Design a protein around this ligand. Structure first.
Ligand SMILES: NC(=O)c1ccc[n+]([C@@H]2O[C@H](COP(=O)([O-])OP(=O)(O)OC[C@H]3O[C@@H](n4cnc5c(N)ncnc54)[C@H](OP(=O)(O)O)[C@@H]3O)[C@@H](O)[C@H]2O)c1
Length: 342
């Protein structure tokens, strides 16, 4: 009844491991190096938690060693390892290749060593593999759980963001392709989670460092920006709380109605100024120490960009999502409380 989760040191995965441990699961996480494993084991301080070392998912057969040693005992797999680096130097190598190869390596290791053992696979895809990056401010476009990013390998490398979205899209394509062709060879059922911009507090307060993970560094950077910094007010994208994402991942392998499902995790439109407005609204004693408030955003006049039809996802998950104001507030409080300012 064990749960294996790849990339267990990331922002989202650290919340997934907490949720798995709260439900008294035996968890095997994969991390790059021994020192990361040593710090995480000390942080969780839980006998049910162990870590295996996978230093690079892009590389041939990266996950056979785990299923070599642990195959008999692994019942669920959560494939969350994928690079989120909007400062990538080499778009293929740093985003596309690890995303695709990591997913291919994980599924082949299951097929080779635990074909009749693993029951469910929950893969962390992205809203990026459902949305169209060129049409996020298009109110005529409606996105649901069957929509696909139309990006091609030809136009995937427009910039670092389109490359990341293509890496998520191409990786999820390979996963579903693997499932359709190996349906009689392997036993497991596949579920994919598609979060948008994930905000929320870090699972551990001490992980609040100078530079956070990419999406939460959006909030952190704005929180420490000079007062005269330009903040955009036009519609940016969709958000989701990290605690909702972690919860959805665990339900992904417990609930039979989530089998063969793509789960679109969004809970509202926002701009960078709407985030800044939470700084000024919830912590007014620090007004002037970050960009000022301005209620005149796209969101506040009803402009929310492309339509999100995830009623199927919300129905199947059957739990309520965390609203935007609370998500940003909990993120900001953790940083300010860590700095000793509130
Ligand atoms: N953040 C979002 O808004 C968002 C939205 C949708 C989907 N997602 C997906 O959620 C997952 C976690 O995202 P996150 O925000 O938690 O990112 P993160 O904090 O940077 O975590 C990424 C995790 O994956 C590992 N990893 C990445 N590339 C790797 C490679 N080539 N070899 C081995 N390990 C690798 C990282 O290990 P190291 O740090 O040691 O490299 C880290 O543990 C990602 O798959 C991402 O695509 C995120």
């Amino acid at each position: 009844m064990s749960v294996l989760i790849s990339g267990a040191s990331g922002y989202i995965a650290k919340h997934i491991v907490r949720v798995l441990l709260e439900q008294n699961y035996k968890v095997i996480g994969t991390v790059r190096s021994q020192d990361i494993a040593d710090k995480l084991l000390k942080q969780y301080n839980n006998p049910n938690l162990s870590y295996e070392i996978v230093p690079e998912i892009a590389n041939l057969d990266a996950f056979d060693d785990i299923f070599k040693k642990h195959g008999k005992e692994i019942k669920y797999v959560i494939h969350a390892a994928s690079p989120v680096n909007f400062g990538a130097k080499d778009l293929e190598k740093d985003l596309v290749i690890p995303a695709i190869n990591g997913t291919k390596n994980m599924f082949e290791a299951i097929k080779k060593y635990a074909p009749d053992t693993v029951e469910r696979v929950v893969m962390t895809a992205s809203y990026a593999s459902i949305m169209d990056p060129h049409r996020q401010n298009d109110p005529t476009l409606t996105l649901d759980e069957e929509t696909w990013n139309p990006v091609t390998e030809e136009n995937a490398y427009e910039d670092v963001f389109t490359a990341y979205c293509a890496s998520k899209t191409f990786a999820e394509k390979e996963a579903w392709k693997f499932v359709k062709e190996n349906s009689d060879a392997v036993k497991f059922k596949l579920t994919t989670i598609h979060p948008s911009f994930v905000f929320g507090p870090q699972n551990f307060d001490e992980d609040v460092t100078e530079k956070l993970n990419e999406t939460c560094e959006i909030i952190n950077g704005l929180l420490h920006a000079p007062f005269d910094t330009k903040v955009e007010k036009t519609h940016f994208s969709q958000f989701i709380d990290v605690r909702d994402v972690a919860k959805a991942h665990v339900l992904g392998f417990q609930k039979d109605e989530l089998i063969n499902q793509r789960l679109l995790l969004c809970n509202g439109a926002f701009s960078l100024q709407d985030i800044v407005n939470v700084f000024n609204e919830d912590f007014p004693e620090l007004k002037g120490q970050f960009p000022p408030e301005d209620k005149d955003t796209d969101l506040n006049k009803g402009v929310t960009g492309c339509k999100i039809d995830n009623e199927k996802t919300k129905k199947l998950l059957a739990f309520e999502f965390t609203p935007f104001h609370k998500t940003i507030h909990d993120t900001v409080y953790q940083i300010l409380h860590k700095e000793g300012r509130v």
